[PDB]
Design a protein around this ligand. Structure first.
Ligand code: CMP
Ligand code: CA
Ligand code: CO
Ligand code: CO
Ligand code: CO
Length: 119
C-alpha cells in the first residue's frame, strides 16, 4: 500500500502525537503497515462531535478544520494525527473535523488499533 517514503511520513506523524509517545516502535510500525487510504470531498466531515470513535487518522493531503458547532477550534497541519482521543479513552468524539478542501487521510480502525495493542 505504501512506499518507504510514505511509511516514514506516517511514522513521524504518529510519533509526534503526545498521547501516542507511550507506544513502542514495533507498535507504531504495525499501525503504519495496517493503515489504509481514505479520501474525503470538500465540505464533508471526517469526524462528528458526539459520535463513538471508530478510527484514528493522519492528515496526508488537503486542509482540515476542527469545530465545536459553528465555533472554529483549530486548523490541522499536514501529517498530524487526529481522532485519537475517542479511541484511547473510550469516549465520544470531542469535536467535529471538516474537510476544507478535498482531503486524503491514512486511517486505522479501532479494533485493529486494539489488536495491535494485544500483540
Ligand atoms: N482544541 C483542539 N485542537 C486541535 N485538535 C483538537 C482539539 N479538540 C479536539 N481535537 C481533535 O479532534 C478530534 C475529534 O475526535 P477525537 O475526540 O477522537 O480526537 C479529537 C482531536 O484529535
Ligand atoms: Ca501528530
Ligand atoms: Co465511516
Ligand atoms: Co499536495
Ligand atoms: Co493541500
Amino acid at each position: 500500500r505504501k512506499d518507504s517514503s510514505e511509511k516514514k511520513l506516517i511514522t513521524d506523524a504518529l510519533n509526534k502525537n503526545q498521547f501516542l509517545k507511550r507506544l513502542d516502535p514495533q507498535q507504531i510500525k504495525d499501525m503504519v503497515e495496517c493503515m489504509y487510504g481514505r479520501n474525503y470531498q470538500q465540505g464533508s466531515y471526517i469526524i462528528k462531535q458526539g459520535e463513538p470513535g471508530n478510527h484514528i487518522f493522519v492528515l496526508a493531503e488537503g486542509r482540515l478544520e476542527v469545530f465545536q458547532g459553528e465555533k472554529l477550534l483549530s486548523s490541522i497541519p499536514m501529517w498530524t494525527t487526529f481522532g485519537e482521543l475517542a479511541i484511547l479513552y473510550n469516549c465520544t468524539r470531542t469535536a467535529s473535523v471538516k474537510a476544507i478542501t478535498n482531503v486524503k487521510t491514512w486511517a486505522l480502525d479501532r479494533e485493529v488499533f486494539q489488536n495491535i495493542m494485544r500483540r
